Amino acid sequence: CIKSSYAPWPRAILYGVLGLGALLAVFGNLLVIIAILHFKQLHTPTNFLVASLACADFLVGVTVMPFSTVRSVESCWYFGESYCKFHTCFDTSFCFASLFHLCCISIDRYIAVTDPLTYPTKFTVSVSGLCIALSWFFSVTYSFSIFYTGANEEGIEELVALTCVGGCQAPLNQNWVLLCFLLFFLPTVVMVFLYGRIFLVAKYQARKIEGYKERVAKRERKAAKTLGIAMAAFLVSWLPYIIDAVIDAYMNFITPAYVYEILVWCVYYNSAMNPLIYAFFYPWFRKAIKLIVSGK
């Protein structure tokens, strides 16, 4: 439809800031899916969740990432109008599957920390399997039934570029934006509450071990930084988008297209940081990754 190219200034550093995320989310994730399969020591029921999250994130990195990069910098979608129906249905499922995987990971961590004695019996491969079969089903029966059937555009077509050629977007309407808001919100309160309880337990154990403020301070800092890193990496990536989505539906669609693409990448990018935080932050994973890179 000859839509305005909307080309940016020659400061095209964006390619070297957007493509690196795809390279990370592909290579560092494929290197994690191998360390859980080759080695026979990492076959624990709590590592299957991490492997499933890694696969769901590698799917994003290998399918949606590059096309999203091209669409965001060039603002013109040169890949055919056929894909627009499938591309918008891939990330909508994969990101929510990753969010629910994070929810079960937090639940698992809370169960392990709060209840250490009867941990093996209460959390087996089945529960790990059950967690995986629910999140995926959840990310598939929402994305397909809300986005593929085109039931999210029942009234709003005033965003001149859904009514064009070569334009693809996800303009949630008034009714279904509340459903999306709840989806993102439900698995966040539980995770925050569980991490708060874990931090309180860690502080109590640090208090018990010593006995001196100068000594408890280091333990508190150590126990708080690990949780805060994950909390920030999740919130500052997911929050920006949901806020924008909730504000244009009830609001009369005021949002320049040159920022919406930037905002979406904020949710996407959480993909490049998820494996580097949940896998590489530990000694064991860091040894296996080192061995895989080497000849052996």
Swiss-Prot record:
Which residue intervals are topologically Cytoplasmic?
A: 38-47, 108-127, 197-223
- Summarize the impact of residue 157 to A: Does not affect binding to spermidine
Q: Where is this region: Extracellular Loop 2 (ECL2)?
A: 153-165
What InterPro entries does UniProt report for this protein, alphabetically? Answer: GPCR_Rhodpsn (IPR000276), GPCR_Rhodpsn_7TM (IPR017452), TAAR (IPR050569), TAAR_fam (IPR009132)
Q: Which GO terms describe its biological process?
A: adenylate cyclase-activating G protein-coupled receptor signaling pathway; G protein-coupled receptor signaling pathway
Q: In which tissues is this gene expressed? A: Specifically expressed in neurons of the olfactory epithelium.
The molecular function GO annotations come to: trace-amine receptor activity
Looking up Pfam families in the UniProt record yields:
7tm_1 (PF00001)
Q: What is its main location?
A: membrane
**Keyword Transmembrane among record annotations:** yes
> What does altering residue 91 to A/N/E do?
Abolished activation of G(s) G alpha protein in response to trace amine-binding
Instruction: Name the protein family.
Output: Belongs to the G-protein coupled receptor 1 family.
Protein's UniProt name: Trace amine-associated receptor 9
